[PDB]
Amino acid sequence: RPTVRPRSDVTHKQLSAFGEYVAEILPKYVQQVQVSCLDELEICIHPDGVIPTLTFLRDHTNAQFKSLADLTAVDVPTRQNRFEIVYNLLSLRFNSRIRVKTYADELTPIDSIVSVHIAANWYEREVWDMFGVFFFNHPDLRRILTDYGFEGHPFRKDFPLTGYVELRYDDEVKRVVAEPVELAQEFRKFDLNSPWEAFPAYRQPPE
């Protein structure tokens, strides 16, 4: 089939075995281990075990994931803990990638892993700036991408696309001033959802 990708069940099995390995090494923190059909290993842990899990994966002999590729957050505002913090880690020794997930809400911070990876400094600054997830023991935790006086965390789902304020030059005060946003166009939302389901494999059971 020239239009469908190959599967690589061998690396799927390898990632499953390593998921069993990590889940039995750290039962105190690991809540779920899954391997996708795209051959990616995800380990979902309790927020209290971020430091031990990341330290184990940084320097364990069979699990050398010394390079932190990505640290991001996903706002799913329908679960109780609305932020899913995702760490994508790279193993140069074993040529592998792992994903570690934890959760947070607006009032539950997560311990920073700057003591484990130094890139987590700016990555956690970005997570705090864009989602409002505080990080314990972070050196100079502050905004990194928003404006200096910016209010609110714009990557949240409840934040508007255009924001609440906009800037313009005012000649009376001779400044760049902020005003409530007034669009001359009003971005048109499109309901691009077919009323027929596309993937029966993901059909949720009825409520």
């Binding site: 166009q185 971005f187 048109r188 499109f190």
Partner: protein
């Protein structure tokens, strides 16, 4: 070639427009044909990606070869249907030749 406008008010170019730069208000004409009354393209909002011209099913909207159309005011780059039809009438001797040279690839 009869002179009738190619656009049939189907709006899928503004559906695919990644910058939302097109506004395609439309109504039936006096002869009952499905045509547009407002076709605005904000050239200060457009990203010049050609998605409209590759989405158009009748080759109505095109991105012709004119690039020396810089203006001295912001308003002159807010095109309407009259401006776009004037550009189509102005550049048809070149746009048609380019589409002739290009349409077998697309």
């Amino acid at each position: 070639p009869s002179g009738e406008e190619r656009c049939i008010a189907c709006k899928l170019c503004e559906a695919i427009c990644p910058a939302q730069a097109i506004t395609i208000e439309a109504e039936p004409r006096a002869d009952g044909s499905r045509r547009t009354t407002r076709y605005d393209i904000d050239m200060t909002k457009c990203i010049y990606c050609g998605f409209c011209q590759e989405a158009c099913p009748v080759d109505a909207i095109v991105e012709g070869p004119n690039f020396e159309f810089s203006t001295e005011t912001h308003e002159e780059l807010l095109y309407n249907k009259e401006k776009l039809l004037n550009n189509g009438d102005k550049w048809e001797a070149e746009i048609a030749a380019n589409i002739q040279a290009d349409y077998l690839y697309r």
